[PDB]
A paper describes a structure:
In this study, one of our aim was to elucidate recognition of Emi2 by the Polo-box domain (PBD) of Plk1 using X-ray crystallography and biochemical characterization. To elucidate the detailed molecular mechanism of recognition of Emi2 by Plk1-PBD, we determined structure of the complexes of PBD domain (367–603 of Plk1) with peptides Emi2146–177 or Emi2169–177.
Because we could not identify the binding mode of phospho-Thr176 in the structure of the complex of PBD with Emi2146–177, we crystallized a shorter phosphopeptide (Emi2169–177, containing a single phospho-Thr176) with PBD and solved the crystal structure of this complex at 1.8 Å. Phe169 was found to be located in hydrophobic pockets, which are characterized by the presence of three tyrosine residues (Tyr417, Tyr481, and Tyr485). This binding behavior is different from that of peptides from native proteins including cdc25C·PBD24 or PBIP1·PBD25. To elucidate characteristics of the possible protein-protein interaction site in Plk1-PBD, we mapped sequence conservation scores calculated from the multiple-sequence alignment of various Plk1 homologs onto the surface of Plk1. The two interacting binding pockets, such as the phospho-binding pocket and tyrosine-rich hydrophobic pockets, are located in the middle of an evolutionarily conserved region as shown in the structure of the complex in Fig. 2D. Especially, fluorescence decay of Phe169Ala mutant is minimal compared with two other mutants and wild type Emi2-mCherry, indicating that Phe169 in Emi2 is important for degradation of Emi2 after pathernogenetic activation. For example, Phe169 of Emi2 is located in the middle of a Tyr-rich hydrophobic pocket; this seems to be the first report that a natural peptide binds to Tyr-rich hydrophobic pocket.
Numbering used by the authors:
A (entry chain B): 173 to 177
B (entry chain A): 368 to 593
The structure:
Amino acid sequence: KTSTI
Amino acid sequence: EAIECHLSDLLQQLTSVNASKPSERGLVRQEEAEDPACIPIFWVSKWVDYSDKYGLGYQLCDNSVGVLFNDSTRLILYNDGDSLQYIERDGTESYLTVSSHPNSLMKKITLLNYFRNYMSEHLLKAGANITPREGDELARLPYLRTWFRTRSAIILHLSNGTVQINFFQDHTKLILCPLMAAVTYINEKRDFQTYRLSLLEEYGCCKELASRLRYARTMVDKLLSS
């Protein structure tokens, strides 16, 4: 779960 | 601390702006609230949520990197790749180097490096087209004081007063700073603009910023209540 790719 | 103090100031500023119902004017003049000088020095450009096991890693726009671990401690690596800062739960800070780092910080430094290697390989940089404001030569970095995620956004609270809200559905972003009493809005087109909150109250703004500032009010209240 991360910020925008 | 002054941190608690800056949360109260942001809340008051947002409450004032929203109370004025900025999107409800005879003629909204949002352009009159533009203050490019008020662009933030720091914001979060990338983050990785590994809170199931360790915590949340992030990168600031200056390419420095931090972790807020699940035990409410923070490790921050400067963009020179050697300067370190450890911040304990109660805010106590220690200045270190990866060269001379205490053995006790082995595991956390290894985790910081995991996040560091991941982010420089995976994610887009938020506000990449934005040139930060300034701050003095040898200044210390802020750290992530707290964060949380809702269905609509991830909320990030920096120790320098800044609150950042990244909205999940359309990738719009708000960077709020009580010191400047300003807000930076990053549109879905990654276009951006910085507004003085007092002038937004004076001249009004569009429905989409107004809406986001209402949610921002709710979020800053949540930060304060916790």
